[PDB]
Each structure stands twice: as structure tokens, then as C-alpha cells.
Amino acid sequence: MQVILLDKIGNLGGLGDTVNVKSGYARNFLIPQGKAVMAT
RNA sequence: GAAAUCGCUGUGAAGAUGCAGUGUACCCGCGGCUAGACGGAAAGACCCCGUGAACCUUUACUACAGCUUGGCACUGAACA
């Protein structure tokens, strides 16, 4: 799942950086807590 | 099934009231008996057969449930 980082993450990347993540990571952590968003 | 429904010896789908030969025998009840009518009853349970049935068994066949194995999904993050 491609996601836009709304903040800096340890390994993923920096704010505004697009990265593929596992859908669990996005669904269950990054997106719910506002650390990223769906890269529509 | 219908009967005017005797014995014997023989005959005969092979154990005869009913055929042959023969012997006996007036017609009809009632009380008794059960030898025969292969008496009545139940389309033999025995036995065989049907490419019949059922239920039961198992290391018969083929399946399935259940149980179990791994892959994938739901399922992510850091390090080593």
C-alpha cells in the first residue's frame, strides 16, 4: 500500500515522502494515528 | 370347483372315494373317536435361486465428516 508520510518515521522516510508499506502497517497504525495517509 | 363323497389289490405326475379288476354295501339321523381326506390355518421361516433388500463387520472399493499438516489471507513494527 502506497502511503504519504504526514511525519518523519524511523525507517520509512520523512514528511511528505511516498513509500510502499504493508497494508497492516498502514491500516492498523500509520493511518489511524495520523502518521501517514493513503497515497490516492 | 362340483359331488350320487365304500374296502382291497393293482394302475397312475410314481402313497386313489372318483382309474381297472374285484369285494362289500337298504335310505336317513343322534352320541362318541380322530386313521385318511397328502384335513384347516399362514403364496416354507429350512434349502436354492434373483446380476433381489436390509442391517452389521473389516487391514474390500470409493467417498465424506471429524481430526490434523503446511501455504495464502485476516497479519503489523523494530532490531539480532
mmCIF file of C-alpha atoms (C1' of nucleotides) in Angstrom:
data_model
loop_
_atom_site.group_PDB
_atom_site.id
_atom_site.type_symbol
_atom_site.label_atom_id
_atom_site.label_comp_id
_atom_site.label_asym_id
_atom_site.label_seq_id
_atom_site.Cartn_x
_atom_site.Cartn_y
_atom_site.Cartn_z
ATOM 1 C CA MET A 1 0.000 0.000 0.000
ATOM 2 C CA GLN A 2 1.465 3.346 -1.118
ATOM 3 C CA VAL A 3 1.165 5.975 1.649
ATOM 4 C CA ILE A 4 2.109 9.646 2.085
ATOM 5 C CA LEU A 5 4.033 10.222 5.327
ATOM 6 C CA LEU A 6 2.483 13.122 7.283
ATOM 7 C CA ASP A 7 5.517 12.967 9.633
ATOM 8 C CA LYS A 8 9.059 11.554 9.873
ATOM 9 C CA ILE A 9 9.144 7.795 10.565
ATOM 10 C CA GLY A 10 12.210 5.939 11.881
ATOM 11 C CA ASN A 11 12.836 3.788 8.793
ATOM 12 C CA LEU A 12 10.052 4.538 6.274
ATOM 13 C CA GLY A 13 11.033 8.089 5.370
ATOM 14 C CA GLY A 14 10.452 11.790 6.017
ATOM 15 C CA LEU A 15 7.393 14.082 5.961
ATOM 16 C CA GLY A 16 5.766 14.109 2.518
ATOM 17 C CA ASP A 17 7.717 11.046 1.333
ATOM 18 C CA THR A 18 5.763 8.350 -0.555
ATOM 19 C CA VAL A 19 6.567 4.749 0.450
ATOM 20 C CA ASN A 20 5.016 1.323 -0.081
ATOM 21 C CA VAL A 21 4.124 -0.228 3.269
ATOM 22 C CA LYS A 22 2.377 -3.458 4.248
ATOM 23 C CA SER A 23 -1.343 -2.803 4.372
ATOM 24 C CA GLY A 24 -1.473 -3.805 8.041
ATOM 25 C CA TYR A 25 1.077 -1.150 8.963
ATOM 26 C CA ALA A 26 -0.989 1.493 7.176
ATOM 27 C CA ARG A 27 -4.434 0.215 8.197
ATOM 28 C CA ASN A 28 -3.707 -0.512 11.850
ATOM 29 C CA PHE A 29 -1.036 2.068 12.816
ATOM 30 C CA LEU A 30 0.162 4.780 10.384
ATOM 31 C CA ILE A 31 -3.215 5.963 9.072
ATOM 32 C CA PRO A 32 -5.283 5.602 12.351
ATOM 33 C CA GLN A 33 -2.689 7.652 14.266
ATOM 34 C CA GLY A 34 -2.161 10.263 11.513
ATOM 35 C CA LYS A 35 1.480 9.261 10.897
ATOM 36 C CA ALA A 36 0.603 8.803 7.196
ATOM 37 C CA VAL A 37 -2.259 8.869 4.697
ATOM 38 C CA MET A 38 -3.379 6.812 1.699
ATOM 39 C CA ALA A 39 -1.427 7.749 -1.438
ATOM 40 C CA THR A 40 -4.539 8.008 -3.645
ATOM 41 C "C1'" G B 1 -64.539 -76.318 -8.115
ATOM 42 C "C1'" A B 2 -68.719 -79.511 -8.026
ATOM 43 C "C1'" A B 3 -70.290 -84.312 -5.656
ATOM 44 C "C1'" A B 4 -74.865 -89.740 -6.233
ATOM 45 C "C1'" U B 5 -68.109 -88.333 -1.096
ATOM 46 C "C1'" C B 6 -67.115 -97.596 0.420
ATOM 47 C "C1'" G B 7 -62.995 -101.780 1.188
ATOM 48 C "C1'" C B 8 -58.994 -104.305 -1.127
ATOM 49 C "C1'" U B 9 -55.161 -105.298 -4.860
ATOM 50 C "C1'" G B 10 -53.218 -103.008 -8.970
ATOM 51 C "C1'" U B 11 -52.629 -98.673 -12.016
ATOM 52 C "C1'" G B 12 -51.267 -93.798 -12.401
ATOM 53 C "C1'" A B 13 -47.438 -86.710 -12.076
ATOM 54 C "C1'" A B 14 -44.643 -92.641 -9.037
ATOM 55 C "C1'" G B 15 -48.893 -93.100 -1.389
ATOM 56 C "C1'" A B 16 -56.555 -93.228 -5.227
ATOM 57 C "C1'" U B 17 -63.773 -92.028 -2.534
ATOM 58 C "C1'" G B 18 -63.513 -90.845 -8.012
ATOM 59 C "C1'" C B 19 -58.979 -95.280 -12.933
ATOM 60 C "C1'" A B 20 -59.001 -101.123 -13.677
ATOM 61 C "C1'" G B 21 -60.415 -105.724 -11.591
ATOM 62 C "C1'" U B 22 -62.946 -107.178 -7.631
ATOM 63 C "C1'" G B 23 -65.369 -107.498 -2.707
ATOM 64 C "C1'" U B 24 -68.850 -105.331 0.083
ATOM 65 C "C1'" A B 25 -73.000 -102.182 0.635
ATOM 66 C "C1'" C B 26 -81.290 -100.879 2.059
ATOM 67 C "C1'" C B 27 -82.456 -94.869 2.984
ATOM 68 C "C1'" C B 28 -81.529 -91.012 6.957
ATOM 69 C "C1'" G B 29 -80.057 -89.218 11.878
ATOM 70 C "C1'" C B 30 -78.038 -88.658 17.025
ATOM 71 C "C1'" G B 31 -73.854 -89.511 20.746
ATOM 72 C "C1'" G B 32 -68.727 -90.590 20.585
ATOM 73 C "C1'" C B 33 -63.358 -91.186 18.322
ATOM 74 C "C1'" U B 34 -59.693 -88.948 15.159
ATOM 75 C "C1'" A B 35 -56.903 -93.252 10.925
ATOM 76 C "C1'" G B 36 -57.482 -90.697 5.821
ATOM 77 C "C1'" A B 37 -59.488 -86.670 3.025
ATOM 78 C "C1'" C B 38 -51.163 -85.677 1.401
ATOM 79 C "C1'" G B 39 -57.609 -82.370 6.541
ATOM 80 C "C1'" G B 40 -57.885 -76.142 8.087
ATOM 81 C "C1'" A B 41 -54.627 -72.023 9.123
ATOM 82 C "C1'" A B 42 -50.024 -68.863 7.113
ATOM 83 C "C1'" A B 43 -48.034 -67.520 -1.654
ATOM 84 C "C1'" G B 44 -41.960 -72.559 3.549
ATOM 85 C "C1'" A B 45 -39.104 -69.456 8.102
ATOM 86 C "C1'" C B 46 -35.252 -74.895 6.150
ATOM 87 C "C1'" C B 47 -32.690 -75.235 1.128
ATOM 88 C "C1'" C B 48 -31.619 -72.992 -3.612
ATOM 89 C "C1'" C B 49 -32.270 -69.123 -6.977
ATOM 90 C "C1'" G B 50 -32.846 -63.377 -8.133
ATOM 91 C "C1'" U B 51 -26.530 -59.895 -11.591
ATOM 92 C "C1'" G B 52 -33.376 -59.014 -5.022
ATOM 93 C "C1'" A B 53 -33.436 -55.998 0.018
ATOM 94 C "C1'" A B 54 -31.810 -54.607 4.625
ATOM 95 C "C1'" C B 55 -28.793 -54.038 8.675
ATOM 96 C "C1'" C B 56 -23.861 -55.481 10.711
ATOM 97 C "C1'" U B 57 -18.284 -56.074 10.067
ATOM 98 C "C1'" U B 58 -13.290 -55.133 8.250
ATOM 99 C "C1'" U B 59 -6.178 -54.253 7.069
ATOM 100 C "C1'" A B 60 -12.994 -54.981 0.352
ATOM 101 C "C1'" C B 61 -13.638 -50.348 -3.103
ATOM 102 C "C1'" U B 62 -14.818 -45.284 -3.421
ATOM 103 C "C1'" A B 63 -16.040 -41.182 -0.779
ATOM 104 C "C1'" C B 64 -17.310 -37.817 3.258
ATOM 105 C "C1'" A B 65 -17.458 -35.733 8.390
ATOM 106 C "C1'" G B 66 -14.137 -35.064 12.113
ATOM 107 C "C1'" C B 67 -9.136 -34.594 13.426
ATOM 108 C "C1'" U B 68 -4.581 -32.974 11.742
ATOM 109 C "C1'" U B 69 -0.274 -30.693 8.258
ATOM 110 C "C1'" G B 70 1.686 -26.829 5.538
ATOM 111 C "C1'" G B 71 0.738 -22.414 2.032
ATOM 112 C "C1'" C B 72 -2.059 -17.931 1.440
ATOM 113 C "C1'" A B 73 -5.441 -14.334 3.639
ATOM 114 C "C1'" C B 74 -7.232 -11.500 8.120
ATOM 115 C "C1'" U B 75 -1.356 -10.082 9.580
ATOM 116 C "C1'" G B 76 1.954 -5.387 11.739
ATOM 117 C "C1'" A B 77 6.862 -2.779 13.708
ATOM 118 C "C1'" A B 78 11.870 -2.773 15.378
ATOM 119 C "C1'" C B 79 16.283 -4.953 15.998
ATOM 120 C "C1'" A B 80 19.885 -9.615 16.027
#
